[PDB]
């Protein structure tokens, strides 16, 4: 038997639950009712990058806000120039099944992983011209669902074996494994200081991890279905998720509870990608009915629709200067919005 | 200064799209198949100079609602059906009814021979005379493999209209080549609206 401590885990769950009910003195909608709203956000697609052959599962911007990488299931890792619509590189991948990609903040590397259970680091800035694999990071069971660089040497990767992992690229081994999710971890997002990161999974739960301690700090259970997307607020003191129950939710690291739900009656399709604007007033959520509803992150009402895609929007990224939104989809086109 | 970074950027761009054109002629020429019962096992084979690709998932969990969405672009989902047969109906019922796997055809292969326990309706079932075997293995075996064929065809002929097709077989590489030909042909008749 195990009920000597099973009911201990529910009686701990009760006293955490009303500790949040003792902390919910108001709601975010009561505080921000007198905030005069954004208005009507009307973004036109400036660009449309046409070079992929299959569905794009992930893109990632560069910190110079001009280059972006995008991975597709044809076996490609095309680095684009968004200003000029020029492909800078086009990396062929060993595995066609690639579900994530990342760009280094320095700009020297890209990572990509997928159903080969392996994160592959590619040195862009080599002295040969031909972009070759810097490292394969093979310690994960199950598919690789996200990867985000910390610097040129450290990358955190979430995977399908319900664990995240902090790697060391020059050694190849993983420094820290982050366990606790019961469903497979679908997305992560680093804090702006990169001392923390959140991670959503298919257990309808989002956990907050310390990167250097390696432990879970807080757990956020407010959704109903598999969380596909997660993104920090620009302050780093809150984050926003998106799951298969057609709701985004703004969680909160300090109050340890959700503040706001971003719902509509006309929306019954899951969120695949969320991001914020540069200030965090807008929450751009990519959907399965092929458009990207822009949410007023304080008023909870929709401020615009980014309807230009023909298949399911799989990724979404706002620049580090807040000047563009690059949404890829399952038709092989990334569109830069503005 | 003003062209030294730009007209040489559009030169390395046009050396990319020459390789993206050879990579497009080989992407449309290969047929990707998902075979299910590192983390992927790519298996190349070629039947009559048409190259096929078959991907058996290896080190993956038995939770599959999230990586099965990668395989909606494939030509045909090979579903090998070896209690454990009711679990294969409920898996095929999920592949057939998935929102992304609604345009993906299912080749379906069958193996086992020797039930009325896990299927009590089988005892009230005789084989269709309209579909017969030639070599005559047993009258009592061909009434059983035609039952579990009609268990998997009760799923396919239930509200799954002309966008994906089930091809059930009894057990082989020639049969996948003849079914992938039918999948591509029926797609080209749906584009001209002849099917």
């Amino acid at each position: 038997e195990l009920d000597q401590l099973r009911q201990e885990a529910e009686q701990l769950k009760n006293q955490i639950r009303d500790a949040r009910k003792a902390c919910a003195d108001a709601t975010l909608s009561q505080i921000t009712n007198n905030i005069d709203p954004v208005g009507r956000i009307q973004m036109r697609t400036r660009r449309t990058l046409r070079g992929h052959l299959a569905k794009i599962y992930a893109m990632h911007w560069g910190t110079d806000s001009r280059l972006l990488v995008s991975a597709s299931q044809d076996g490609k890792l095309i680095i684009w120039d968004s200003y000029t619509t020029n492909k800078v590189h086009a990396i062929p991948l060993r595995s066609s099944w690639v579900m994530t990609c990342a760009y280094a903040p320095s700009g020297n590397y890209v990572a990509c992983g997928g159903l080969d259970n392996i994160c592959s680091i590619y040195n862009l800035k080599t002295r040969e011209g031909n972009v070759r694999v810097s490292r394969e990071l093979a310690g994960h069971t199950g598919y690789l669902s996200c990867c985000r660089f910390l610097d040129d040497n450290q990358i955190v990767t979430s995977s399908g074996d319900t664990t995240c992992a902090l790697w060391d690229i020059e050694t190849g081994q993983q420094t820290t494994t982050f366990t606790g999710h019961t469903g497979d971890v679908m997305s992560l997002s680093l804090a702006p200081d990169t001392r923390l990161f959140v991670s959503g999974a298919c257990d309808a739960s989002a956990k907050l991890w310390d990167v250097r301690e390696g432990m879970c700090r807080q757990t956020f259970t407010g959704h109903e279905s598999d969380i596909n997307a997660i993104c920090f607020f620009p302050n780093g003191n809150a984050f926003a998720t998106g799951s298969d129950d057609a709701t985004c939710r703004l969680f909160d690291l300090r109050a340890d509870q959700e503040l706001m739900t971003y719902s509509h009656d006309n929306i019954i399709c899951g969120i695949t990608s969320v991001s914020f604007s540069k200030s965090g007033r807008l929450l751009l959520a990519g959907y399965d009915d092929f458009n990207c509803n822009v949410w007023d992150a304080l008023k909870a009402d929709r401020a615009g629709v980014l309807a230009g895609h023909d298949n399911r929007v799989s990724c979404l990224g706002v620049t580090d200067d807040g000047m563009a939104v690059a949404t890829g989809s399952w038709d092989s086109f990334l569109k830069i919005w503005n | 200064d003003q062209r030294n970074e730009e007209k040489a950027q559009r030169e390395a761009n046009k050396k990319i799209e020459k390789q993206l054109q050879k990579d497009k002629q080989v992407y449309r020429a290969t047929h990707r198949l998902l075979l299910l019962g590192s983390g992927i096992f790519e298996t190349k084979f070629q039947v009559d100079k048409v190259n096929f690709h078959m991907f058996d998932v290896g080190a993956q969990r038995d939770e599959r609602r999230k990586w099965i969405q990668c395989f909606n672009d494939v030509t045909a989902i090979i579903f090998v059906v070896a209690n454990r047969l009711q679990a294969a109906l409920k898996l095929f019922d999920s592949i057939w009814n998935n929102k992304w796997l609604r345009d993906t055809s299912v080749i379906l292969f069958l193996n086992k021979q020797d039930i009325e326990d896990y299927f009590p309706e089988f005892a009230r079932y005789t084989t269709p005379e309209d579909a017969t075997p030639e070599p005559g293995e047993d009258p009592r075996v061909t009434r059983a493999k035609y039952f579990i064929r009609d268990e998997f065809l009760r799923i396919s002929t239930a509200s799954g209209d002309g966008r994906h097709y089930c091809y059930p077989h009894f057990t082989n590489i020639r049969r996948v080549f003849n079914d992938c030909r039918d999948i591509i042909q029926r797609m080209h008749l749906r584009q001209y609206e002849l099917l």
């Epitope: 319900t162 019961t182 469903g183 298919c202 257990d203 309808a204 259970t221 109903e224 279905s225 598999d226 298969d244 129950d245 057609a246 019954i268 899951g270 | 969990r61 038995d62 939770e63 599959r64 609602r65 679990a87 409920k90 898996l91 019922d93 999920s94 592949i95 009814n97 998935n98 929102k99």
Partner: nanobody, 126 residues
């Protein structure tokens, strides 16, 4: 938080009856297809029954058909399973598993690994 507390169970004579409830928490019960899933001692998890989001489309496995019935009450957020004419082969731990997404017809929820949206189970013995 998705919590599913299934009730009922216990010991029964071969030929007896049971009524397993399942109180659902943390999600709108009306949007999800709900299942009943059992795990026999020494076996893996096999799927038992199923019911659509309104109570219209109802399925059973072959070994329980006729004897078992499934029911849901979207107003009281409770999923039922009446197990009449029980057998010695029917003893298992009965889980109340739901499908992972709302408004869908596909479910992937008999997994040896941890499926998240099922209950801890109730034990049915004979």
């Amino acid at each position: 938080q998705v919590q599913l507390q299934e009730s009922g169970g216990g010991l029964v004579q071969p030929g007896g009856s049971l009524r397993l409830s399942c109180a659902a928490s943390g999600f709108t019960f009306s949007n999800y297809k709900m299942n009943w899933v059992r795990q026999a001692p020494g076996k893996g998890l096999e799927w038992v029954s199923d019911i659509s989001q309104s109570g219209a489309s109802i399925s059973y496995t072959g070994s329980v058909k006729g004897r078992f019935t499934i029911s849901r009450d979207n107003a009281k957020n409770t999923l039922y399973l009446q197990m009449n004419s029980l057998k010695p082969e029917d003893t298992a731990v009965y889980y109340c598993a739901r499908c992972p997404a709302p408004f869908t017809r596909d479910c992937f929820d008999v997994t040896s690994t941890t499926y998240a949206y099922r209950g801890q189970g109730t034990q049915v013995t004979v």
